Amino acid sequence: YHGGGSGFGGQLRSWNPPSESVDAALLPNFTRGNARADDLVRNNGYAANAIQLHQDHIVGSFFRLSHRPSWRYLGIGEEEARAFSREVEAAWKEFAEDDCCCIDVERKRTFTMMIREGVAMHAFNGELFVQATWDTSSSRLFRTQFRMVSPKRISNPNNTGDSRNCRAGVQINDSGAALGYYVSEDGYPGWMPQKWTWIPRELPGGRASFIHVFEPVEDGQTRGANVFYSVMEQMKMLDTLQNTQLQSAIVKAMYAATIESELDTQSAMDFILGANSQAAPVRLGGAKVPHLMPGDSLNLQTAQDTDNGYSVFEQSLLRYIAAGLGVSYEQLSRNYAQMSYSTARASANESWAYFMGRRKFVASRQASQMFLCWLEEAIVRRVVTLPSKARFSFQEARSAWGNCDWIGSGRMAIDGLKEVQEAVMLIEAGLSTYEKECAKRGDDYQEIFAQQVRETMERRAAGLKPPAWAAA
Amino acid sequence: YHGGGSGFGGQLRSWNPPSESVDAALLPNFTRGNARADDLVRNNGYAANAIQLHQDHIVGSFFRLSHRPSWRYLGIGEEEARAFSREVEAAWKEFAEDDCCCIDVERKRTFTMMIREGVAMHAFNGELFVQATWDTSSSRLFRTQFRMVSPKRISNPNNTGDSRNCRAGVQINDSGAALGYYVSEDGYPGWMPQKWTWIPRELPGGRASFIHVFEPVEDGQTRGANVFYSVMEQMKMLDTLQNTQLQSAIVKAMYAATIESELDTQSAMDFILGANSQAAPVRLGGAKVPHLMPGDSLNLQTAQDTDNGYSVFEQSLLRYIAAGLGVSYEQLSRNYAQMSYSTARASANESWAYFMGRRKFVASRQASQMFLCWLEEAIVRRVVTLPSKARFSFQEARSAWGNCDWIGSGRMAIDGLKEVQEAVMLIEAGLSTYEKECAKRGDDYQEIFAQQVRETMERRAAGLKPPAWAAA
Amino acid sequence: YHGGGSGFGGQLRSWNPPSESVDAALLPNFTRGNARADDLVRNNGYAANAIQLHQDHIVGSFFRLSHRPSWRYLGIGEEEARAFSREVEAAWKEFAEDDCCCIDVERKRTFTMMIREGVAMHAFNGELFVQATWDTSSSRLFRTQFRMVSPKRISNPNNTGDSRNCRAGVQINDSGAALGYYVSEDGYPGWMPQKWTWIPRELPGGRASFIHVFEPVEDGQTRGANVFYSVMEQMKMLDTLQNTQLQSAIVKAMYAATIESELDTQSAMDFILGANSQAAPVRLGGAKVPHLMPGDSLNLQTAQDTDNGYSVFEQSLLRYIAAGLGVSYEQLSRNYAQMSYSTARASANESWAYFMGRRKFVASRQASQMFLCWLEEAIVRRVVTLPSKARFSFQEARSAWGNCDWIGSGRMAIDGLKEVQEAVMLIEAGLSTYEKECAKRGDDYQEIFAQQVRETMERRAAGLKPPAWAAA
Amino acid sequence: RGNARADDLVRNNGYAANAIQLHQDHIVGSFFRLSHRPSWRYLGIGEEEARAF
Amino acid sequence: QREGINASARYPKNWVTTGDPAREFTMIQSAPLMLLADPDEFVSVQLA
Known about the structure:
The structure is cut from a larger assembly and holds four copies of chain A and one copy of chain E.
Chain A: H1 22-26, H2 30-43, H3 45-59, E1 64-67, H4 71-74, H5 78-96, H6 111-124, E2 128-134, E3 144-149, E4 166-167, E5 170-172, E6 178-183, E7 197-200, E8 210-213, H7 232-254, E9 257-260, H8 265-271, E10 297-300, H9 310-325, H10 329-333, H11 341-380, H12 398-401, E11 404-407, H13 416-428, H14 434-440, H15 445-462
Antiparallel strand pairs in A: 1-11, 2-3, 2-8, 4-5, 5-6, 6-7, 9-10
Chain E: E1 11-16, E2 24-29
Antiparallel strand pairs in E: 1-2
PDB class: viral protein
Keywords: Complex, viral protein
Entry title: Structure of the bacteriophage lambda portal vertex
């Protein structure tokens, strides 16, 4: 195996990376890496575009709930399960998308923006912390409020050399489970003394208190790694190349001509450039034919091509950056050159696979945990009543009572008609149901059925022709 | 035979490679190769993109179970087998999809995440390890848990050499089969020396305790080799070439002019560039025409084309690397040249064959072993019941009772309508069935049938036209 | 004839290859040839791709068994023959595809894995060996265990010079047949020297105890010749060329500029490039314009085109190598230039002819011999019962009882709709049967028919429409 | 400084003014209409009076 | 080197000298060296 050897001709005799765990290769440089990623996001055109694409495609304009408790396992009966689902969905709809924005303690974001910001933080930081608090002094029906914590404030044990159990400010038991996190205080003025607080992961009653979301890579990973470690260096170097090329082009274009003469500068520029002595500005009106004595001379400088093949190299670097980040090349670079229908559809599919994976993991898990945390409070406060004769209590079956599914925004078709024909053809056969085809457009089938059954009544009552879907 | 000889003109007089099995060519340089491959996966965009392709196409966003016990051999009956399969599928679906992530001890993954990580860790290391233990103190329904172990941990105790019966931290009996594994301790700090334990592969009852999945190449191979050994050198050299070309382009485009004179540095820039003495900064406004005495001069330096044939060489190297890894070139480099439909479909199918092979072997074997380890408990703890009048006990034939088939995510076709049209054409004739077609979309036909029989009733009761599949 | 003469103008005066048989042309340089083949496979992007294509297209992900005993030759009866076939297929399907992987003693492969390893070994070594043994310690139903023997193991004892009857560790009787194989033990680090043991090809009872598969070239070929001898030189030389070209590109792009002066080494860089002495590092921020005296100078180097025709010549070499190995150029190089549908389909046909040949010979012969060796234990151990009134016993005509044909994975068509239309139109006429059409998709037609006959009952019970295949 | 510089760009440069006009024209358009949908199930009032309201 | 063996123990070979009287030889060769990581773990005495 040449890979592990000296190399071809000794070229690899100095490439001996240490065999260390992921933690010992990530934690010593955590803060600097996070800071560099933030600097890239805040000051680069393409990084901001990538974050915007993440937020808009993974989550979308709306992130709607779909509750499906497993009634077979609980033995509660179909109608009771459906009624309980309807009541829970109505309660959540009234609590999640309110206008007063009381879901968040800071009173700044609704639920959809909270999901979007969580995906963003998971994009350029590789983790997200949502803290579920209480305000017993409040008079509202639901006193469970959530807060988003920046991963910077989950500091280590104050940066000192740490240990085995206490890693990166996340207290750990004998196994890999996490017991308690450390939270700091974000002080903008910069002079207040810092205070660190302990916030346990779970309350003694089993309720979720402080939430951590990320995707691991190896056996042990206390804190995650963002998607920029692959391609930061090329991004910064490309930005520097862009600025340097732009400045060089401006410098080369600035010096138009060059006067060579023997007389005084005022006289030489007076008798050649046409500037009047009555430095010296030159009027830009008309055409001029200067008269040059044998000593004098005039030279019109020529410059290189302004973009002598820089765009192709930009193309290569942007292709590399897009490959590293995950999105397609067209979306990141806005190039959209000439391409057939097949190439565009392949591009869209290759992006959408990754987008679906990310949505199914990060947003879905965060939303499910937040929804369960609210559901416990709703159940306890008798706002929602469980069916009787339950095989388990709510404590004994946490997921089974609230096994929920979420529907996000659906794809925007490249061909408007082909997708419609595909959906209709699948519906005509038995291969796919109504829910599957209505959900790909991000609509719930029950609402569509109710809307149609009131539309038929309105059309019948108003004196118009009955609709197509009405039953004769 | 000229292959085994000196060569053409004696050019291959020094090409004399050692004749040795996989062990003698892999074991001495295992850690170095793993560390370099991990460096490339961590610090190169393209390799990380290949890993993401592996994870997303091999597994997807869901890894569904389909239980098909061989009831004919067991002599139990079709209906009892169907009821048993339904019960065990429901129990597995509730156990392994817990919102609190309690399948794994570390409480950081779910089942699909764990399968994806197993595939990835197979990709860049060559093997995947899963340890099955119990938490006796836990009071949940199932006490089985699984921990993912990184391949770096398995090493000889006290870092000694390889003995005949202990190669690379894996015990080997008189035959080639393994007997037990040596596991180090997770040492994040450099200090705090490491403790080496001993974990038998199988408990005395025959239940799986430690899982090792990897594909051998030769007769005796204690541990496998990852997919990167073919292209370890080329990716590093390609990275070095990219960085060097970018730095060289920036340097060459930096120097936009050159001043020749015989005066002081300050005055020469005052008189020609136009800077002010109150080196000297120059503001970029306007177009400037200097005046030069005979001794002076001004050269606007010209640089080469920034990208002279670098893109095509990058193309050739990326084609080589993709051919080495197994992912198609357009999936790796995001190139997507102007190509017809036939070429895109050919490339997608050529990559798809390999992807289906990997999913059928790696992920399927790991998930089957894990599912068997869980099914022992379900049976023993009497959560589910065995069919009566069985020819064999469960332990005498584990595979027959726990035989299972897994379904991943279906491919996303280049043309939307043609796939649906071919599916309907197949179903209309006898060449296929509903199960195989519904499986190619990652769906279970029984669930679709239940959904349709619910939807027809819901439409009938509400006053709508009955669906297409409804029976008169 | 000028082929056997001096040539055009005596240019072929020195080309006098010796007229020697294959045994005298392969054996003297056997081990070096195999070692060079392994080295090329282990350290090249293209060789590993060729091996992967061989494995994935010849066999695929599943290699099913279809038993068709010759009942007319034995005279047993149709119903009894089908009963025996069903019983033996069920027993084999249980034994072959265990997830405990206990078919081989090392417990690391399934049956399809073993067939794939056989195909791969037949690719880069020219021969495969399988040892069929028994385990009296095992308490399972079937005691048969197989193994894979690397061709390097089987050699002459103690490297003793070669003989007449015993050539290259394979013993030959008076005719060309082989009786026994000398196989050595292999421990890489040390221990007592290799002990060469005797293993007879076939036991006294006629059972096959050692398997050797390879296709001869001439009348007498004791050991096979690998497929790489044709093109081993060119792949190594292409490797050297690619590495040299990449290093040359790096070297040429490294030296950006050049400074000529007459002052100190550091002062010249301080005054021209702009570095600071507060070699001397230079900052890449902004644009710069130095000031030079008459003596000094600055030069911006220009490097040759990075990829000056290397891609086309690599294309030619890959075409040659693809012709040599058997895989089409489009599969090996991942190029996929703009090609119409006709060219792509023709190239696919060219690849598929060779792949069908290899699947019909190599894997099929290995699988047939393995299956017969297993079927002897079964018949003997009364796990299955032979039909009555048999004209011959099992040992009299082994091929009669085990006459089987295997199903591999089918082809993934370039256009999905067209092949389905072809199959449907052929089915409508009498030219082809359902068994062939369902076999070309890798399906067993009896299983398919059982599936439809169960699905129609399932649809009837649940209240859905009868399917198209149902009979009124 | 950031807000003042952004104002300077939007006032004087053609591409910034075009971008702002695109925002105004595509986010809102030429009109903005209301559809009042109280959650009548939550309040337990009815449907006819909800529609009249 | 020709048959691909280097850095191993007990390399055997067998050859015949080409000549009018031809004889056959047999030879095995190795490079045996024995070490200890810690030279001071064993105490060697002489008794009486």
